[PDB]
């Protein structure tokens, strides 16, 4: 395992503001692209502030479709739920997060990411592969609104892999007023061989706001997000 002498482990690494670096390499129907992101996370408040840039030119998919792929260790876990925080418990060695995201009546993304500390920086390194998309559909045809809605993300233990399974749905807004469903199937597994916290069933409550940097001429996304764990509740 880790050196114990190690000063901070698991949740101890998140008591303050932590710098975040995100790196994504993607290929959707052979459209290749890369995204980098930077900012900070303050788990005490469940607060994420991040700016992402497409480093290869124009992003060939809508930015909103990448939000879930682009650090659940920054969730605010209530003190009364702290024993259910898998994500921080896996740190600093980290965890692998894998998803399949099914876009209804369109293609799918498959993603694999490793989330771990490199010194003081929490790093999310991702590979994304998309296939079976319609060239003129809502994704490759860029028919989605640049916005986001609030969601619950449902977490349960996966004892076989010493990890968790996560499931949720995102409904992106199409420019004609309709909805593009993106059904998310997710699993996380620790990278290290030490103990992790395997949670009871619960959820994370997300709020997300997308904006633009008026001084940024590259294709980019500014993201402000708040994340709180809930769903496990006589004192009063
Ligand atoms: Cl976009
Ligand atoms: Cl997150
Ligand atoms: Cl928004």
Curated annotation (Swiss-Prot):
Q: How is it used?
A: Green fluorescent protein has been engineered to produce a vast number of variously colored mutants, fusion proteins, and biosensors. Further generation of mutants led to more stable proteins (at 37 degrees Celsius for example) with brighter fluorescence and longer fluorescence lifetimes.
- Tell me what the record says results from residue 71 to N: In R10-3; matures to the red-emitting state with excitation and emission maxima at 555 and 585 nm, respectively
Swapping residue 170 to T leads to an effect described as: In P11; increases fluorescence at 475 nm excitation and at warmer temperatures such as 37 degrees Celsius. In Esmerald; leads to brighter fluorescence. In VisGreen; leads to brighter fluorescence
Instruction: Name the reported effect of residue 83 to R.
Output: In Azurite; shifts the excitation and emission spectra to shorter wavelengths and increases quantum yields compared to BFP
Q: Does the keyword Ion transport apply?
A: no
Keyword Ion transport (UniProt): no
Q: Which GO terms describe its biological process?
A: bioluminescence; generation of precursor metabolites and energy
Consequence when changing residue 201 to I:
In mut2.1; shifts fluorescence lifetime from 3.03 to 2.50 ns
Entry PTM: Contains a chromophore consisting of modified amino acid residues. Maturation of the chromophore requires nothing other than molecular oxygen.
Q: What is the effect of changing residue 170 to V?
A: In P9; increases fluorescence at 475 nm excitation. In R10-3; matures to the red-emitting state with excitation and emission maxima at 555 and 585 nm, respectively
Result for mutant: residue 148 to A? In Cerulean; leads to improved quantum yield, a higher extinction coefficient and is 2.5-fold brighter than ECFP
The record gives the effect of mutating residue 179 to A as: In mut2.1; shifts fluorescence lifetime from 3.03 to 2.50 ns
The entry's stated outcome for residue 153 to I is: In Azurite; shifts the excitation and emission spectra to shorter wavelengths and increases quantum yields compared to BFP
Which InterPro entries does the record cross-reference, listed alphabetically?
GFP, GFP-related, Green_fluorescent_prot
UniProt keywords (A-Z) are: Chromophore, Luminescence, Photoprotein
What is the recorded name of this protein? Answer: Green fluorescent protein
